[PDB]
Design an enzyme around this catalytic site. Sequence first.
Site, PDB file in Angstrom:
ATOM      1  N   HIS A 110       0.837  -1.344   0.000  1.00 25.54           N
ATOM      2  CA  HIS A 110      -0.113   0.028   0.226  1.00 25.54           C
ATOM      3  C   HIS A 110       0.781   1.283   0.014  1.00 25.54           C
ATOM      4  O   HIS A 110       0.358   2.371  -0.173  1.00 25.54           O
ATOM      5  CB  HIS A 110      -1.007  -0.022   0.932  1.00 25.54           C
ATOM      6  CG  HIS A 110      -1.782  -1.054   1.401  1.00 25.54           C
ATOM      7  ND1 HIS A 110      -2.817  -1.452   0.640  1.00 25.54           N
ATOM      8  CD2 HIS A 110      -1.832  -2.040   2.115  1.00 25.54           C
ATOM      9  CE1 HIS A 110      -3.338  -2.401   1.005  1.00 25.54           C
ATOM     10  NE2 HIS A 110      -2.808  -3.248   1.791  1.00 25.54           N
ATOM     11  N   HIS A 134       6.272   6.985   6.163  1.00 23.66           N
ATOM     12  CA  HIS A 134       5.759   6.359   4.658  1.00 23.66           C
ATOM     13  C   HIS A 134       5.475   7.634   3.860  1.00 23.66           C
ATOM     14  O   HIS A 134       5.011   8.792   4.581  1.00 23.66           O
ATOM     15  CB  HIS A 134       4.616   5.256   4.693  1.00 23.66           C
ATOM     16  CG  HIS A 134       3.649   5.704   5.238  1.00 23.66           C
ATOM     17  ND1 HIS A 134       3.546   5.767   6.847  1.00 23.66           N
ATOM     18  CD2 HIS A 134       2.506   6.601   4.957  1.00 23.66           C
ATOM     19  CE1 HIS A 134       2.153   6.195   6.775  1.00 23.66           C
ATOM     20  NE2 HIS A 134       1.563   7.017   5.936  1.00 23.66           N
ATOM     21  N   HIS A 183       2.452   9.165   0.580  1.00 24.68           N
ATOM     22  CA  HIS A 183       1.354   8.766  -0.450  1.00 24.68           C
ATOM     23  C   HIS A 183       1.743   9.765  -1.447  1.00 24.68           C
ATOM     24  O   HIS A 183       2.235  10.888  -1.591  1.00 24.68           O
ATOM     25  CB  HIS A 183       0.008   9.452   0.300  1.00 24.68           C
ATOM     26  CG  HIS A 183      -0.306   8.725   1.552  1.00 24.68           C
ATOM     27  ND1 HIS A 183      -1.091   7.504   1.632  1.00 24.68           N
ATOM     28  CD2 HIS A 183       0.262   8.879   2.603  1.00 24.68           C
ATOM     29  CE1 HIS A 183      -1.020   7.186   2.967  1.00 24.68           C
ATOM     30  NE2 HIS A 183      -0.364   7.886   3.691  1.00 24.68           N
ATOM     31  N   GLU A 192      -2.703  13.819   0.665  1.00 26.81           N
ATOM     32  CA  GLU A 192      -3.856  13.632   1.292  1.00 26.81           C
ATOM     33  C   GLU A 192      -4.721  14.783   1.773  1.00 26.81           C
ATOM     34  O   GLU A 192      -5.727  14.924   1.388  1.00 26.81           O
ATOM     35  CB  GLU A 192      -3.624  12.465   2.350  1.00 26.81           C
ATOM     36  CG  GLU A 192      -3.120  11.141   1.559  1.00 26.81           C
ATOM     37  CD  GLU A 192      -3.298   9.903   2.587  1.00 26.81           C
ATOM     38  OE1 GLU A 192      -3.036  10.179   3.759  1.00 26.81           O
ATOM     39  OE2 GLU A 192      -4.139   8.878   2.079  1.00 26.81           O
ATOM     40  N   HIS A 229       4.483  11.088   5.858  1.00 28.69           N
ATOM     41  CA  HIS A 229       3.886  10.997   7.124  1.00 28.69           C
ATOM     42  C   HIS A 229       4.734  10.281   8.116  1.00 28.69           C
ATOM     43  O   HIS A 229       5.164   9.102   7.957  1.00 28.69           O
ATOM     44  CB  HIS A 229       2.736   9.959   7.291  1.00 28.69           C
ATOM     45  CG  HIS A 229       1.442  10.604   6.382  1.00 28.69           C
ATOM     46  ND1 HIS A 229       0.503  10.141   5.809  1.00 28.69           N
ATOM     47  CD2 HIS A 229       1.265  11.939   6.307  1.00 28.69           C
ATOM     48  CE1 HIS A 229      -0.440  10.809   5.415  1.00 28.69           C
ATOM     49  NE2 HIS A 229      -0.072  12.114   5.423  1.00 28.69           N
ATOM     50  N   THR A 268      -5.498   7.494   7.977  1.00 26.77           N
ATOM     51  CA  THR A 268      -5.933   7.531   6.666  1.00 26.77           C
ATOM     52  C   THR A 268      -6.036   6.261   5.823  1.00 26.77           C
ATOM     53  O   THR A 268      -6.452   6.182   4.618  1.00 26.77           O
ATOM     54  CB  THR A 268      -4.892   8.560   5.756  1.00 26.77           C
ATOM     55  OG1 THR A 268      -3.958   8.197   5.547  1.00 26.77           O
ATOM     56  CG2 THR A 268      -5.054   9.968   6.508  1.00 26.77           C
TER      57      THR A 268
HETATM   58  N1  J75 Z   1      -1.442   7.171   6.656  1.00 30.60           N
HETATM   59  S1  J75 Z   1      -1.276   7.384   8.085  1.00 30.60           S
HETATM   60  O1  J75 Z   1      -2.511   8.179   8.744  1.00 30.60           O
HETATM   61  O2  J75 Z   1      -0.234   8.090   8.407  1.00 30.60           O
HETATM   62  C1  J75 Z   1      -1.269   5.555   8.819  1.00 30.60           C
HETATM   63  C2  J75 Z   1      -2.219   4.790   8.584  1.00 30.60           C
HETATM   64  C3  J75 Z   1      -2.171   3.454   9.024  1.00 30.60           C
HETATM   65  C4  J75 Z   1      -1.283   3.178  10.181  1.00 30.60           C
HETATM   66  C5  J75 Z   1      -1.312   1.624  10.769  1.00 30.60           C
HETATM   67  N2  J75 Z   1       0.031   1.434  10.989  1.00 30.60           N
HETATM   68  C6  J75 Z   1       0.220   0.295  11.800  1.00 30.60           C
HETATM   69  N3  J75 Z   1      -0.757  -0.717  12.243  1.00 30.60           N
HETATM   70  C7  J75 Z   1      -0.486  -2.036  12.726  1.00 30.60           C
HETATM   71  N4  J75 Z   1       0.617  -2.246  13.102  1.00 30.60           N
HETATM   72  C8  J75 Z   1       1.929  -1.294  12.964  1.00 30.60           C
HETATM   73  N5  J75 Z   1       2.902  -1.682  13.537  1.00 30.60           N
HETATM   74  C9  J75 Z   1       3.356  -2.621  14.425  1.00 30.60           C
HETATM   75  C10 J75 Z   1       3.190  -2.457  16.058  1.00 30.60           C
HETATM   76  C11 J75 Z   1       2.010  -3.144  16.637  1.00 30.60           C
HETATM   77  C12 J75 Z   1       1.743  -2.986  17.997  1.00 30.60           C
HETATM   78  C13 J75 Z   1       2.950  -2.641  18.986  1.00 30.60           C
HETATM   79  C14 J75 Z   1       4.334  -2.142  18.221  1.00 30.60           C
HETATM   80  C15 J75 Z   1       4.208  -2.063  16.812  1.00 30.60           C
HETATM   81  C16 J75 Z   1       1.670  -0.212  12.384  1.00 30.60           C
HETATM   82  N6  J75 Z   1       2.854   0.955  12.255  1.00 30.60           N
HETATM   83  O3  J75 Z   1       3.763   0.320  12.511  1.00 30.60           O
HETATM   84  O4  J75 Z   1       2.643   2.036  11.959  1.00 30.60           O
HETATM   85  C17 J75 Z   1      -0.366   4.182  10.594  1.00 30.60           C
HETATM   86  C18 J75 Z   1      -0.487   5.535  10.162  1.00 30.60           C
HETATM   87 ZN    ZN Z   2       0.022   8.209   5.580  1.00 32.24          ZN
END
Ligand code: J75
Ligand code: ZN
EC number: 4.2.1.1
Length: 257
Positions: A61, A91, A93, A103, A116, A195
């Site tokens: 993604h 990361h 977009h 975004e 982000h 997002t």
């Molecule tokens: N586009 S946005 O709004 O900036 C955005 C969209 C979606 C996310 C979704 N990220 C994560 N989801 C699950 N596990 C993760 N990591 C593993 C983890 C889980 C539990 C404890 C410690 C580490 C992460 N992650 O690492 O970010 C983050 C930011």
């Molecule tokens: Zn993002």
Amino acid sequence: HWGYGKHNGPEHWHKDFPIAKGERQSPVDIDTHTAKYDPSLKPLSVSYDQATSLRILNNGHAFNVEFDDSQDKAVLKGGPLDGTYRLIQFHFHWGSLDGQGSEHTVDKKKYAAELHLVHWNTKYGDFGKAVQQPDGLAVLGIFLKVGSAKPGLQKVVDVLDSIKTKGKSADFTNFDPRGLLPESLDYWTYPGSLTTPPLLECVTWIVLKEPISVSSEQVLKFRKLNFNGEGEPEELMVDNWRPAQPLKNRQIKASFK
Ligand SMILES: NS(=O)(=O)c1ccc(CNc2ncnc(NCc3ccccc3)c2[N+](=O)[O-])cc1
Ligand SMILES: [Zn+2]
């Protein structure tokens, strides 16, 4: 299942994730004339001197540059935030063309891409618990426009061909995220969401006013990535952005002017 297409893109996400139609969804259009200057907002404190990047991953993604977040080494605080938020990954977009990709928008203007930098509130102990709280995450958003190269971006661009397809990862140590920050830390801020699914309403957004410039060649390399896994029909990883969502109640605050 979810993604960015006709049949699985943003307009479909609400069927698996009903908060997509919720009260504090992101991104949003930032109407700069309506944003309220708040003299009580503090300077943002970005303390990235001891950051430890570990790896870069194509997750199907976007691509994530991941950090060791098991100690206070790369943290965000101040600004609109209470307490301390640890950097876990960044990361981007981006678009298929330079005229789209961000975004957030600014008076309806799209930028070519948006970075982000994702941070979680240390009072909740880990990312997974933080996303279940209304003040769990602080995401620093930075717009990219196409112009001069960003020299601090080139290490990331040059490793992309090693993580072309979904599920590929590469060691990515000693990357300094300070090389991705513009000169000014003036910002807008509002309460919102992730997002991408699961779209959780756990984010204090802090969006920098000043974009960074990257070259046409650097954002070209983003667009050579693939949403598919190796040995599958090639899907270029482009237009992985969610459009602006209804603001509803919410007031955007400005730290400047
Ligand atoms: N586009 S946005 O709004 O900036 C955005 C969209 C979606 C996310 C979704 N990220 C994560 N989801 C699950 N596990 C993760 N990591 C593993 C983890 C889980 C539990 C404890 C410690 C580490 C992460 N992650 O690492 O970010 C983050 C930011
Ligand atoms: Zn993002």
